[PDB]
Structure 1
Amino acid sequence: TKQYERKAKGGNLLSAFELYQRNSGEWFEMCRDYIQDGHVDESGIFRPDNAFYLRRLTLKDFRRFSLLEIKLEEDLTVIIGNNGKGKTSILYAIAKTLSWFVANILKEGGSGQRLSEMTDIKNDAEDRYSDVSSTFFFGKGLKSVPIRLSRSALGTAERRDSEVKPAKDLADIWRVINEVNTINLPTFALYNVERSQPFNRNIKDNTGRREERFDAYSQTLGGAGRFDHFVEWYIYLHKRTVSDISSSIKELEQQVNDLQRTVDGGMVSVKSLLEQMKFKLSEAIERNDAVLTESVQKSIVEKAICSVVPSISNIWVEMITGSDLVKVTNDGHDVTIDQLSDGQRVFLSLVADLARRMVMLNPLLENPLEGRGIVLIDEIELHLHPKWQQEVILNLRSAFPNIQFIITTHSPIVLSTIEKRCIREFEPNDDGDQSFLDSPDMQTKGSENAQILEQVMNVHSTPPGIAESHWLGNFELLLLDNSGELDNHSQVLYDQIKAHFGIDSIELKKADSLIRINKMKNKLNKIR
């Protein structure tokens, strides 16, 4: 129609797509360019012209929340609060919404997930129904994609309907355009506390193919990842790379060259091995000579893992024992995945799973990890030592620069690495009637952990329930009661402080300082 033509020529993606569907060249190319166009910035990072992220979330009578609004950052949002403030509820609400995009990218008219009629409606809500309303942005040509998931409580005779058509409309553009000519697709993932699990290599899932592109959407919002799928996929990649003869020739050529250098260096014992390898190389060359995309995919993921996971410097597959084993160099030692600590394994699992999915869904990017998507992570500090908590957000954002991260944490150490604008904080005595979340007053990025504890997390830097925590205060008060002179009582407490904290303790130095200052103040008073 002429109206659609005008809007489409103005840059409206939905109008362009409608014109494409009715006529089924011009309009197709508009849609495809809208999705694929972008540029490399000054830092060498690819940036899509049309970004995709969650802008705003509204919760009505959902779990603890009567009516709550959250504005999200395009890049990173961190939600903080005490246990029971609804941080996980917020992530669950978002994950259910995203399930509608995933379902419709996989299948026309696919069904996403639903709010629970048993648990998700606020217990004391007079209207016995709940609403989760989201708005997504996809460039200037599609500034608002509104979705509502709704559910009525189990007894209730009126039933409240969800509104998911806009999600389906956008997902249809991705699916249809991709079918005609391949495009990069968005990644959606949820990593909740269920990501901590025992590993068993023995169990293999025989449901679908791990090399098939849309397997990247399999259980993507289930909370755990599929680390098993990663391992299967990685072994697959390895087998294909080893089976490619030219890379094997190149690898064999490199091995022959390395062995020849050793023989030239005076090690005559390896001459027999060199001759064997030269024979193997000649045979490989003789066999019918023809870069595997599988080889590149493998390299990308290996680099991602090693860059993000601090203790891991290398990852590879061994088959020589007679079973396929993934091995890693962890803190300078070669180990199996099964031998990693739970903290290392769980974090490895997260990154491996995420990297795999991005590689599969972004085949046309030079760096597939620069793809688009929304990733939710609950309790990012789970099982991490403080040392690692100081690196984790920085590493993730470096590896995945165009993902919108929505994170929850209880860690001041994590908060010390993040800007205040990214932080959303619950009011201290909330009771689930606060209308809008806000950022803290203090700047967290680069600040001391003890300050973040007190100013942002509302916790004393010294434990108030321990008597020894009050001794210095009591000591000072005793000193001031006796005109600054150490009396019997003040001396006893001084000795207690010395005995408990030690001769080199900060606390004792403070006590000493108090003595010195007060003595000098008293002397001044006497002179006057």
Structure 2
Amino acid sequence: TKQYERKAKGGNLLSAFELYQRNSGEWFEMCRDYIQDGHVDESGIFRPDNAFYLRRLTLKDFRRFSLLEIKLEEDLTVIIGNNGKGKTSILYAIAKTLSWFVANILKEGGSGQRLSEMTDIKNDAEDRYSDVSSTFFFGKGLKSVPIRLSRSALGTAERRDSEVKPAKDLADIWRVINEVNTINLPTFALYNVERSQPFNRNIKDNTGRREERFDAYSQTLGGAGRFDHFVEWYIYLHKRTVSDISSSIKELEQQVNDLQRTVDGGMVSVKSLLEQMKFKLSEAIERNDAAVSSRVLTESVQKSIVEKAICSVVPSISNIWVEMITGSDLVKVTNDGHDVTIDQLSDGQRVFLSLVADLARRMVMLNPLLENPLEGRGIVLIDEIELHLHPKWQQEVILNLRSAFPNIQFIITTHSPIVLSTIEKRCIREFEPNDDGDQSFLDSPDMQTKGSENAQILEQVMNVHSTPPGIAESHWLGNFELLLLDNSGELDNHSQVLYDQIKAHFGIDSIELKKADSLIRINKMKNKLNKIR
């Protein structure tokens, strides 16, 4: 109608799409440009003009939460708190919501995941239902995409229905426009603690499913990734790089031509073989055309992008490649300067490799039109980012991820003050330590964490003493000081004994002994002044 036309010309994406659907060129192009338009920043990074991210989340009678409201950052949000505060519950809530986008990008009227009647409803909820309400943002044309997941407890007074239509509507735009002309698609992924799992050596050979673009959405929100799928896909990429498809077409074309000449020469026995070869040729051309039709990055380029990402983000890995050993393809890595198989990697290295490899694979598959596919859009959830990492890696991990995936919204959980030392306080959302489930707002810490000392973050943000209070030796310096002050600053028998204990335990060069020495010096001087007076 005229109203839709005005709103669409004003830059409203839904109105433009509705006009496209009813008339089914200009409206199509508007929708496509809204999704595809972007610019390169001063750092050489592509930036979409219309960003997509989760802006707000509200939880009502969900697990431990009677009511919780969270505002999220466009780039990075870190949730911190003690064990059992509901950090994982928050990520699960988001993941379920994202499942509705994924389902509807894949299939019209696809269903995402529902809240559990048994586990997701708060135990003492008066209303005996749970709500997960989320609001998404997609550029100035679509400032609010509200979604609500609802579930009623088993006894059932009344049905509380979920409201998912806006998710479906938005996902429909992506699906339909992509069908007509290939567009870049958003990546959604959850990496929970299940990512820590043993590697199976037995690589199933390429049946064909891993090369399909929408395999990138397969089990994206299941928690583990699919590192097995990566390995299969990567070996596949390698084999295709060693063997060109057009030469096979040219060779097949030559074979078909030779067989056609034989059939024309009176050998009717080879007609069956000719028909088979013509079929094979047509299939090869179709695959080539589909590959051509998909407007896709070359297999060589795809391989290179992923390899670079892995080597840049994973500190111990300097190189990754496929070897033909014996009669079976093996992925090898240069780890800590030595060539090893994936099965030889430490659990920390493997788990982190798995995360990055999986994410990179999906981004390459979903962003074929970008020069750097890792600059695509998406929302990635990571539980316990520090899992299996030494402190030295914890100091690098957030920096590396954000550098490799500059346009992803990361929502992460951590217990690590070392991680927090690399992050701005605005990105941090902290639970109150004494929270008995009746807290409306998660809040930022008062101290600036980025560039701060770890000991300070322990005490000021994580509410933990820098020294273990249930060790006696931790109190000796305090006790020593008190004894010195009780005896007008002179080392008495008791203070000397404790001094010797401190010396014996911590050592001659210890900070503790130096502090004790300092106390002696200062107190002696103070006493001398007092006597002069």
TM-score of the pair, normalised by structure 2: 0.90
- Provide structure 2 residue ranges, at least 5 long, that are not aligned to the other structure: 290-295
Instruction: Identify if the C-alpha distance between structure 1 residues 44 and 483 changes in structure 2 by more than 3 Å, giving closer, same or farther.
Output: same
- Preserved CA contact (<8 Å) 2:203 2:231: no
**Secondary structure in structure 1 of the residue aligned to 2:158:** coil
Deviation, 1:155, is 1.6
- Preserved CA contact (<8 Å) 2:59 2:133: yes
- Preserved CA contact (<8 Å) 2:205 2:232: no
Instruction: Identify if the C-alpha distance between structure 1 residues 227 and 268 changes in structure 2 by more than 3 Å, giving closer, same or farther.
Output: farther
Instruction: Identify if the C-alpha distance between structure 1 residues 87 and 302 changes in structure 2 by more than 3 Å, giving closer, same or farther.
Output: same
Q: Distance in 1 between matches of 2:520 and 2:101?
A: 68
**Secondary structure in structure 2 of the residue aligned to 1:130:** strand
**Secondary structure in structure 1 of the residue aligned to 2:530:** helix
Deviation, 1:246, is 10
Deviation, 1:389, is 0.2
Deviation, 1:85, is 0.4
- Preserved CA contact (<8 Å) 2:206 2:236: no
Deviation, 1:286, is 26
Which of 379, 383, 391 is residue 374 of structure 1 equivalent to?
379
Deviation, 1:319, is 1.1
Q: Distance in 2 between matches of 1:222 and 1:351?
A: 16
Instruction: Identify if the C-alpha distance between structure 1 residues 449 and 246 changes in structure 2 by more than 3 Å, giving closer, same or farther.
Output: farther
Deviation, 1:282, is 29
Q: Distance in 1 between matches of 2:46 and 2:419?
A: 27
Figure out how many residues of one structure are paired with residues of the other and give that number.
527
Q: Distance in 1 between matches of 2:82 and 2:437?
A: 13
**Secondary structure in structure 1 of the residue aligned to 2:328:** coil
Deviation, 1:322, is 1.1
- Preserved CA contact (<8 Å) 1:241 1:247: no
Name the structure 1 match of 2:507.
502
- Preserved CA contact (<8 Å) 1:208 1:215: no
**Secondary structure in structure 1 of the residue aligned to 2:474:** helix
Q: Distance in 2 between matches of 1:232 and 1:439?
A: 43
- Preserved CA contact (<8 Å) 1:133 1:146: yes
Q: Distance in 2 between matches of 1:371 and 1:377?
A: 18
Name the structure 2 match of 1:337.
342
Deviation string 1:356-388 (CA, Å, 9 cap, x unpaired) is 000000000000000000000000000000000
Instruction: Identify if the C-alpha distance between structure 1 residues 383 and 253 changes in structure 2 by more than 3 Å, giving closer, same or farther.
Output: farther
Identical amino acids, percent of aligned pairs: 100
Instruction: Identify if the C-alpha distance between structure 1 residues 281 and 144 changes in structure 2 by more than 3 Å, giving closer, same or farther.
Output: closer
Q: Distance in 1 between matches of 2:530 and 2:260?
A: 88
Deviation, 1:156, is 1.8
Name the structure 2 match of 1:310.
315
**Secondary structure in structure 2 of the residue aligned to 1:523:** helix
TM-score of the pair, normalised by structure 1: 0.91
- Preserved CA contact (<8 Å) 2:59 2:66: yes
Name the structure 2 match of 1:132.
132
Further displaced range: 50-59 or 236-245? 236-245
Instruction: Identify if the C-alpha distance between structure 1 residues 505 and 277 changes in structure 2 by more than 3 Å, giving closer, same or farther.
Output: farther
**Secondary structure in structure 1 of the residue aligned to 2:209:** coil
Deviation, 1:436, is 1.1
Q: Distance in 2 between matches of 1:407 and 1:297?
A: 27
Structure 1 ranges of 4+ moved more than 6 A: 205-208, 245-289
- Preserved CA contact (<8 Å) 1:242 1:248: no
Q: Distance in 1 between matches of 2:60 and 2:232?
A: 42
- Preserved CA contact (<8 Å) 1:70 1:437: yes
Q: Distance in 1 between matches of 2:62 and 2:36?
A: 37
Further displaced range: 243-252 or 465-474? 243-252
Instruction: Identify if the C-alpha distance between structure 1 residues 44 and 91 changes in structure 2 by more than 3 Å, giving closer, same or farther.
Output: same
- Preserved CA contact (<8 Å) 1:100 1:164: yes
Deviation, 1:474, is 0.2
- Preserved CA contact (<8 Å) 1:230 1:353: yes
RMSD after superposition:
9.2
Which of 477, 480, 485 is residue 482 of structure 2 equivalent to?
477
Deviation string 1:21-52 (CA, Å, 9 cap, x unpaired) is 00000100000000000000000000000000
- Preserved CA contact (<8 Å) 2:58 2:70: yes
Q: Distance in 2 between matches of 1:526 and 1:59?
A: 67
Deviation string 1:409-434 (CA, Å, 9 cap, x unpaired) is 00000000000000000012111111
Further displaced range: 364-373 or 266-275? 266-275
Deviation, 1:244, is 2.5
Instruction: Identify if the C-alpha distance between structure 1 residues 90 and 271 changes in structure 2 by more than 3 Å, giving closer, same or farther.
Output: same
Deviation, 1:443, is 0.2
- Preserved CA contact (<8 Å) 1:201 1:228: no
